[PDB]
UniProtKB/Swiss-Prot annotation:
Residues with Phosphoserine modification: S1, S91
Tissues of expression: Expressed in myeloma and epidermoid carcinoma cell lines.
Illness association: Chung-Jansen syndrome: An autosomal dominant disorder characterized by developmental delay, intellectual disability, autistic features, anxiety, hypotonia, obesity, and dysmorphic features.
Entry's localization field: Nucleus
UniProt-recorded name of the protein: PH-interacting protein
Phosphothreonine modification, residue list: T45
Gene, per the UniProt record: PHIP
Described function: Probable regulator of the insulin and insulin-like growth factor signaling pathways. Stimulates cell proliferation through regulation of cyclin transcription and has an anti-apoptotic activity through AKT1 phosphorylation and activation. Plays a role in the regulation of cell morphology and cytoskeletal organization.
Subunit structure: Interacts with IRS1 and IRS2. Interacts (via bromo domain) with acetylated lysine residues on histone H1.4, histone H3 and H4 (in vitro).
Domain Bromo: 2-107
């Protein structure tokens, strides 16, 4: 498909699947700072899936690359905050990341192909 706009609904459908995953529950809303009082001593830029969905729905992503950078920050934040590579929440993040990467690969490829077709002449 050479549709330059198709990534947006493809990303909405993938966020729907991520919200149905039990593994997403820790990442649906901002990290609770009363629960984890040192969180902002370790994490400079908090990110969560509700924030990513709102950003997309506001029309404040220009490309699926930008959405992909914010989703990858959800996962790098969990790796940076975990006290162990065996923690429950970190382990959930690694399964959810594998799922996300499996699904976003075609979204990115199709978008970049569409942009190349737009500039072909
Ligand atoms: C109000 O409802 C909420 C329910 C759950 C959450 N999630 C959190 O508080 N988080 C804890 C720290 N995070 C980690 O990635 C993490 C790696 C290791 C360990 C122990 O935590 C992110 C997720 C936020 C709001």
């Amino acid at each position: 498909s050479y549709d330059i706009q198709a990534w947006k609904k493809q990303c909405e459908e993938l966020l729907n699947l991520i919200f149905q995953c039990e593994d997403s529950e820790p990442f649906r809303q901002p990290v609770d700072l009363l629960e984890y009082p040192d969180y902002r001593d370790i994490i400079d830029t908090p990110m969560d899936f509700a924030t990513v969905r709102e950003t997309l729905e506001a029309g404040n992503y220009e490309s699926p690359m930008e959405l992909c950078k914010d989703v990858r920050l959800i996962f790098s934040n969990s790796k940076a905050y975990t006290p162990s590579k065996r923690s429950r929440i970190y382990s959930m993040s690694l399964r959810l990341s594998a799922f996300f990467e499996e699904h976003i690969s075609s979204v990115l490829s199709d978008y970049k192909s569409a942009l190349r077709f737009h500039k072909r002449n």
